[PDB]
C-alpha positions as a Python dict, from the first residue, in 0.01 Angstrom:
ca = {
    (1, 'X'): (0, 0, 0),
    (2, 'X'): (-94, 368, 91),
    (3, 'X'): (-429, 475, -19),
    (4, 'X'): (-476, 800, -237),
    (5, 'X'): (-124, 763, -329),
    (6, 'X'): (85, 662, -679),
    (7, 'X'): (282, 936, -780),
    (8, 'X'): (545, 757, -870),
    (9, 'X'): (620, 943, -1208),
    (10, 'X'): (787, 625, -1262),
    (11, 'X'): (1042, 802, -1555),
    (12, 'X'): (852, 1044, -1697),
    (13, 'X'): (716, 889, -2044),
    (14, 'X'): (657, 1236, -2188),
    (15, 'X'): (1030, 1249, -2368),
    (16, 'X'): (1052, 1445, -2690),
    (17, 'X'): (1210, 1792, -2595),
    (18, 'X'): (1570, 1699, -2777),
    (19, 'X'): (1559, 2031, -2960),
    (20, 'X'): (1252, 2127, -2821),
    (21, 'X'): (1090, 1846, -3025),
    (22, 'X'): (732, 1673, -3005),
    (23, 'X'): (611, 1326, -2973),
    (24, 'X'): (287, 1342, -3084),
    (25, 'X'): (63, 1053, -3171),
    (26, 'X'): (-291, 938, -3234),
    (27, 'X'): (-558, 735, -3358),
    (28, 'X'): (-598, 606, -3739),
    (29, 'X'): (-943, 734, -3835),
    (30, 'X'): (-968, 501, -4112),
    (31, 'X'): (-759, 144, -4181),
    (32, 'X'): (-808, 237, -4560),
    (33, 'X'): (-514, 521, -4527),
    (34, 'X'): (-266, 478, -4744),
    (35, 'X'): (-49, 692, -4527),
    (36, 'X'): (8, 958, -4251),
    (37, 'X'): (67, 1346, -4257),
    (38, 'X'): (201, 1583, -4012),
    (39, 'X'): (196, 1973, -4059),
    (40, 'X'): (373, 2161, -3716),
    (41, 'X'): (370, 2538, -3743),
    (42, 'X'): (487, 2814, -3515),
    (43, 'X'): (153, 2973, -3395),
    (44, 'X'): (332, 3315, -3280),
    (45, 'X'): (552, 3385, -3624),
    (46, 'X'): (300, 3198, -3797),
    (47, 'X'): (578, 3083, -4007),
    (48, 'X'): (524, 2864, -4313),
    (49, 'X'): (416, 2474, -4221),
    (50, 'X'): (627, 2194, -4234),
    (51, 'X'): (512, 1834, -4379),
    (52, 'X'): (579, 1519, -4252),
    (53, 'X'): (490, 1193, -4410),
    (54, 'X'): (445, 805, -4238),
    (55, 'X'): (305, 512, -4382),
    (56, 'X'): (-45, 385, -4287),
    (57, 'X'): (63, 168, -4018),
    (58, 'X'): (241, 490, -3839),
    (59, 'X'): (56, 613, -3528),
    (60, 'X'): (319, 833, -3399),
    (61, 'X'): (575, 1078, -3483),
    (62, 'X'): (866, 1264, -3282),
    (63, 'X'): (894, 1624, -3472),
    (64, 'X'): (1255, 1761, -3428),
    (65, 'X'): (1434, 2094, -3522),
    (66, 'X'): (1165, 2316, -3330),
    (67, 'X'): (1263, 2622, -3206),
    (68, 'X'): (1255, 2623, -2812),
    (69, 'X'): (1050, 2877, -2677),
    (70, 'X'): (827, 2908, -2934),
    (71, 'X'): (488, 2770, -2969),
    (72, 'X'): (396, 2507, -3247),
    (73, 'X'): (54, 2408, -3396),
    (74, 'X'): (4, 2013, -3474),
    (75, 'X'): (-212, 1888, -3744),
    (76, 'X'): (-247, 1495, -3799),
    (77, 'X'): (-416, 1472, -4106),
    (78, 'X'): (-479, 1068, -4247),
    (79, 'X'): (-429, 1005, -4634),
    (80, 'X'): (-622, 810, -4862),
    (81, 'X'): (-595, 568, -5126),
    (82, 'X'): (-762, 844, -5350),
    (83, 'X'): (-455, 1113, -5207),
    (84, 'X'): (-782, 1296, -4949),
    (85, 'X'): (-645, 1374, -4627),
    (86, 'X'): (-873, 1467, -4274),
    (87, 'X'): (-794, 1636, -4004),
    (88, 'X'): (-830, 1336, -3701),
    (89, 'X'): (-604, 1499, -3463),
    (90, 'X'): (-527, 1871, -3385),
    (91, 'X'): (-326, 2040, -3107),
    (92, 'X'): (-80, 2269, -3002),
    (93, 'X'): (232, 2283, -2786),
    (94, 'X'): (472, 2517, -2628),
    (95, 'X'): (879, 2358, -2669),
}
């Protein structure tokens, strides 16, 4: 049992690149969503956003077709009964 040391990387949970892809989840901000929405963008071309929609019970998304190389703003954004959606998660990432 050596002290100071785990690295075991045991096998890498981190898995999403698959054409340069994203597994990106989070925390529901409210139980009264009636469903999920995620918005990836490229933050260099600034090209136009991309929707994705899950159900109220989804916490987690893989986001594929991404350009490697390329850098990709994440928006998690929770939807309402009433169709209101807030931002409760928002970060970037480099494929």
């Amino acid at each position: 049992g050596p002290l100071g040391s785990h690295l075991v990387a045991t096998s890498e949970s981190v898995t999403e690149i698959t054409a340069s892809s994203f597994v990106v989840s989070w925390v529901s901000a409210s139980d009264t969503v009636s469903g999920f929405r995620v918005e990836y963008e490229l933050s260099e071309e600034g090209d136009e956003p991309q929707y994705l929609d899950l159900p109220s019970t989804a916490t987690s998304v893989n986001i594929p077709d991404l350009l490697p190389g390329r850098k990709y703003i994440v928006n998690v954004y929770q939807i309402s009964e009433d169709g209101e959606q807030s931002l409760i998660l928002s970060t970037s990432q480099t494929t």
